[PDB]
Amino acid sequence: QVQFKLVLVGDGGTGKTTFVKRHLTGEFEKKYVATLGVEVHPLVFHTNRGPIKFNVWDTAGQEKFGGLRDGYYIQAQCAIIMFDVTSRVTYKNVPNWHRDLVRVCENIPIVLCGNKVDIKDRKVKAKSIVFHRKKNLQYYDISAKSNYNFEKPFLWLARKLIGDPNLEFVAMPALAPPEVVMDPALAAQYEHDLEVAQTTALPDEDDDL
């Protein structure tokens, strides 16, 4: 319906895919599996102006896996440029990504995101991050891991795309859930599945939650 093409660009390892997955499923993927060319995922937010759908084109940051490269940007309606605040080279490359992006997409809203602020030893100092000012990009410190500011890039983009500065995310309707009884035939398989689940430790047991 109301859907917008969003392209996500930035150096390999900056957290693009992890960030999208967090938003898609709620999970935090610890492993680094490099994106091959691009992965497309629809992502819906519920707002006080109705649902907004982003078709997220999560592009490869590794040169060797770049695929169609700027070919992915064609007809994008918005974008996120990612870097990693623990890696100065990734900030240094931001102008390169931005160059390639705006050559294809001349007038779109773009958010610049400095990811991994959860890591204690920050290398790209806050005071250093100024590239967005002359390019009219929005900027946020974010962490896919802690969820710090994780909703901000999508909220800002939605506001710009719908053209409503007072747009807010709203609680989606919660339909009454059904009453189901376990299949007696599957009860023995239930026992096994639960045993494996019980004996697989939960991750990050030192976290606040």
């Binding site: 709620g26 009884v181 599945d193 639960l194 697989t200 939650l209």
Partner: protein, 130 residues
Amino acid sequence: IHFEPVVTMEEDEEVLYKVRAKLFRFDADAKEWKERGTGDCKFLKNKKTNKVRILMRRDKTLKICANHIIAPEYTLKPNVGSDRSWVYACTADIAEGEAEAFTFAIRFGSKENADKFKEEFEKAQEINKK
């Protein structure tokens, strides 16, 4: 003299219990727990039908990460790595859309909260029995 003036679906429900929590779902294909959401987990009693459900929404996005009846058949079990979590099988959760079975784990800020959840969970089960 008259001067003309200038021109969620949780409404029918009582909140029995609310607690801050992190919810996980077990991926059997992989062999790992995956986070589904962090936020307020509510036990909601429908004022018309008297049925009690778990409804949990993610902070900030407010997206539903749990929505299911607290079935009398369910049983909260400990996880090997935690003294502040419960694991249980759910046959019919609709947070993502069509009803689907999951093995859930829910973790709390402390053991005391976890033990309170279980007591409230079991109370809610008795309500759903009536």
